[PDB]
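lol so apparently i was supposed to do this last week
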Amino acid sequence: TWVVSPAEKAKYDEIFLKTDKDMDGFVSGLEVREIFLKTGLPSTLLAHIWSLCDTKDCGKLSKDQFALAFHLISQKLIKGIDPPHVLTPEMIPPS
Ligand SMILES: [Ca+2]
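anyway here it is w/ calcium ion bound
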């Protein structure tokens, strides 16, 4: 199960390749930044969305984690919906 996965994960999996400027399966807010700055969300929210997707809690956005953040930001670009407060069991990745 996962809040994001279909087209969304694809629309992102393709961006993570352009987001993870270090191609290390982990893009940092510093790279996805512009990508997040192109979204149109307020800094705080974008930083709040980074922790809402950075389930890795390591300081970077893994490959599938950066796809969970757009699941929120994207909702504000075409669905105008706030972010799901904090992390949820449907957001947290499988381990
Ligand atoms: Ca990176």
